[PDB]
Amino acid sequence: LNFGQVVADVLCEFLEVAVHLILYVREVYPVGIFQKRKKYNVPVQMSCHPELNQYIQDTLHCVKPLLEKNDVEKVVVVILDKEHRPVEKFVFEITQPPLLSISSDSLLSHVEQLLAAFILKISVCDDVLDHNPPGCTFTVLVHTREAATRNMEKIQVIKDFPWILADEQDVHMHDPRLIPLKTMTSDILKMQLYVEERA
C-alpha cells in the first residue's frame, strides 16, 4: 500500500477541480461551459466541454507519476495574454513530508477540509486581481524536484500528448505582485497556493 500514490491521487483530483475553477473565476473560457457543483462540500465550477476536460485529465495523468515519487516542486497554471506573455501564475507549491503520517482519525475528511479552504480562496480571488485582457489562454508548467531522474520521459504517459521544456517567454514575469491564497500543512501534504501577477 503506497501512500505516496494515495497523496498523488488526492492532489490530481484536487488540481483538476482547482484548474477548472481558475479557468472559471479568471474567465479564460465562456461561462456557459461551466456547471455549478459541490466538491469538498464547497461550491465549485466544472466545465462540461469534453475536449477541454480531456486536456486537463491528460495533463494531470501525466503529472501523477511524478507526484507519486514526490518529484514535483511546483504545479503552475499560467495565463497567457493575446501576445503569449504570462499575465498570472497560479503556483501550487507541493511537497510531501519526509515521512508521511497516516492517522486513522480520518485521513480523508481533514485533508478535504484543508483542500476546501483552497477552493474558497480561489473563488474570491477575482475581487483582488485585475480583469485579464480579452483573448487570454492558459498553460500548465511543472517544476521538478532539484534532483530528479529523467522526468522528461516519465511524464510522457499519454499517447500523442507530449511534453517539452518551456521557454523563457512562457515564464517571463519580472517583478510581479504576490497574492497569497492559502497554506496548509498536514501529516501527508504541505501545499502552498499563491498568485503572481504582472505589474
Binding site: 469534453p50 489562454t137 521538478t144 507530449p162
Partner: peptide
C-alpha cells in the same frame, strides 16, 4: 526551467459554449 505540454488547450468557440450550455448542462 519547467516542463509544459506541447499541445495547447482547445479553443472553445462561443457556438460550442452555447451548445455545451444547451446540451451538456
Amino acid at each position: 526551467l519547467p516542463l509544459r505540454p506541447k499541445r495547447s488547450p482547445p479553443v472553445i468557440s462561443e457556438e460550442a459554449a452555447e451548445d455545451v450550455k444547451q446540451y451538456l448542462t
